[PDB]
Design a protein around this nucleic acid. Structure first.
Lengths: 36, 330, 100, 54
RNA sequence: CCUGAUCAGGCGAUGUGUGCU
């Protein structure tokens, strides 16, 4: 399956490739409807 | 007359063309069934529903009998003598009413019974969908893998099943594989009926070659006889309708690309398009394809026929289980 | 909204709702085991969605209630005992039942 | 006065008398629902086998 | 897993102790 675990620093190109979107607001969860 | 049932009848997404007043009566009978299911006296139920106002009422029954069980719905003829014998044996003559109950337990019971009646209406409409064709050459995609039967999903939520004795002996189906067949029966099983097919008849290959050949529709060539031992071996004799045209060449396509595709409809059929001529002598001699015919005798009174051939041709003209020979006979 | 302490709970048979009274608090002196209902308390979950069948049902009964969750107190799984005492507290502005 | 004698005649035979009224028939079915009485019984006069003298 | 009739509804970290090995 795998052979080794490798660690290194993370360039910002790589960090933008991990994600699936951007977060822009501090709002947690809606009220009266328990949906984000 | 609250007019809630007025707008409630005219929802009308799935039951517009379905019976609206009958669905209203069925929902009323479900609610009255729950209302029976809350008291302890086991009395039968009757809801009475109005179309003009929308409002309704709940009546109890008395259920004329010659017996004593179900005693809150038990009546007899000597008790009908006080009604001057007007009741007959057996009737469900109602002689009582009930009023109302809020009852969140019974509210959940009404929701469950309404889901049951909605399921019944769905089954009824699916049988109505089957009633508009009643049986046809139609394809499906099987979804479930049961024992000696395969369940098939089709379009517009209709379904079917394939029986194993209706299926091939060796060819075993698997999900993701499409199967086209002629359906021939809808037997009423428990909680509604389901479609059943049999994709093994010569009708299936016949309609497959009709959908395949463009000369088959336009009467350039006629399909004289289609004979199939299904899955194993098959020989069909066809001729051109006086056009000097290759019937095997037109019904074969490019490099067998009709019939070898059409055999894929049967699931591996060994099919032979065969020639046919004017008199039954040359037509049967060419329907003895693939073989060589030296001579053929026939009897004009009683329909009997005899052929002779070499042994290297006799092995080809006989067949394993008489498939070629019974094929030419039928 | 507020939460009721009523006896008419959905989704449970008579097996759980047998020790309760008409008010929804278990009888003083009743042998209970692990897994039974002591106080029947249902909550409004919030409306949040409705379907054609519940629309039809809401026209039939006229009940507003109608999307209700259960949050009944139940005996922790394993203990036993016989209920010897029941205390109820209400803040002002609330009506009192038969029990209080 | 005893429900056994009421059982000795059938319920239809009870219905052949105007001494029974409308609510009385409901009371008849309500008592007979408990499977104790009015099931159309017949004895010799009073006693069955377990109704023996001892 | 638990509860009811294939569907619905239920899965905490810190700190303070205190007690056992």
């Amino acid at each position: 399956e795998f052979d080794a675990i490798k660690i290194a620093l993370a360039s910002p190109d790589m960090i933008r490739s991990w994600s699936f979107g951007e977060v822009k607001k501090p709002e947690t969860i809606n009220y009266r409807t328990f949906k984000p | 007359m609250n007019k809630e049932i007025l707008a409630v009848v005219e929802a009308v997404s799935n039951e517009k063309a379905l019976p609206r007043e009958k669905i209203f009566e069925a929902l009323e009978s479900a609610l009255a069934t729950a209302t029976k299911k809350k008291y302890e006296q086991e009395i039968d139920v009757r809801v009475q529903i109005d179309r003009k106002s929308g409002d309704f009422d709940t009546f109890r029954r008395w259920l004329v009998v010659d017996e004593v069980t179900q005693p809150t719905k038990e009546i007899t003829l000597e008790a009908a003598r006080y009604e001057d014998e007007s009741l007959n044996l057996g009737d469900y003559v109602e002689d009582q009413i009930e009023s109302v109950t809020f009852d969140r337990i019974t509210t959940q019971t009404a929701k469950q019974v309404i889901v049951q009646k909605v399921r019944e209406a769905e089954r009824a409409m699916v049988v109505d969908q089957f009633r508009e064709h009643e049986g046809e050459i139609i394809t499906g995609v099987v979804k479930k893998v049961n024992r000696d039967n395969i369940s098939l999903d089709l379009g517009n939520n209709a379904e079917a099943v394939i029986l194993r004795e209706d299926m091939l002996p060796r060819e075993n189906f698997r999900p993701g594989d499409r199967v086209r067949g002629v359906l021939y029966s809808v037997r009423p099983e428990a909680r509604g009926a389901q479609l059943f097919v049999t994709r093994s008849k010569p009708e299936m290959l016949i309609e497959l070659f009709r959908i395949e050949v463009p000369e088959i529709g336009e009467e350039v060539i006629e399909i004289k006889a289609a004979a199939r031992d299904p899955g194993s071996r098959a020989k069909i004799a066809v001729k051109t309708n006086d056009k000097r045209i290759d019937p095997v060449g037109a019904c074969v396509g490019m490099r067998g690309a009709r019939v070898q595709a059409v055999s894929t409809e049967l699931g591996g059929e060994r099919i032979d398009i065969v020639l046919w001529d004017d008199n039954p002598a040359q037509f049967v001699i060419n329907a003895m394809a693939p073989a060589d015919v030296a001579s053929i005798v026939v009897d004009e009174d009683k329909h009997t026929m005899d052929i002779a051939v070499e042994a290297g041709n006799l092995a080809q003209a006989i067949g394993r289980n008489g498939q070629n020979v019974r094929l030419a006979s039928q | 909204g507020p939460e009721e302490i009523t006896a008419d709970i959905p989704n449970v048979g008579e097996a759980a709702l047998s020790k309760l009274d008409e008010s929804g608090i278990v009888y003083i002196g009743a042998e209970v085991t692990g897994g039974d209902i002591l106080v029947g308390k249902v909550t409004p979950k919030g409306e949040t969605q409705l379907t054609p069948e519940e629309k039809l049902l809401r026209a039939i009964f006229g009940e507003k209630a109608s999307d209700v969750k259960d949050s009944s107190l139940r005996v922790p799984n394993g203990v036993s005992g016989t209920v010897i005492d029941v205390q109820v507290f209400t803040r002002d502005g609330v009506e009192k039942d038969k029990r209080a | 006065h005893y429900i056994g004698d009421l059982v000795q005649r059938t319920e239809v035979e009870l219905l052949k008398t105007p001494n029974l009224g409308k609510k009385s028939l409901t009371e008849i079915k309500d008592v007979l629902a408990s499977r104790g009485l009015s099931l159309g019984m017949r004895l010799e006069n009073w006693p069955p086998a377990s109704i023996a003298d001892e």
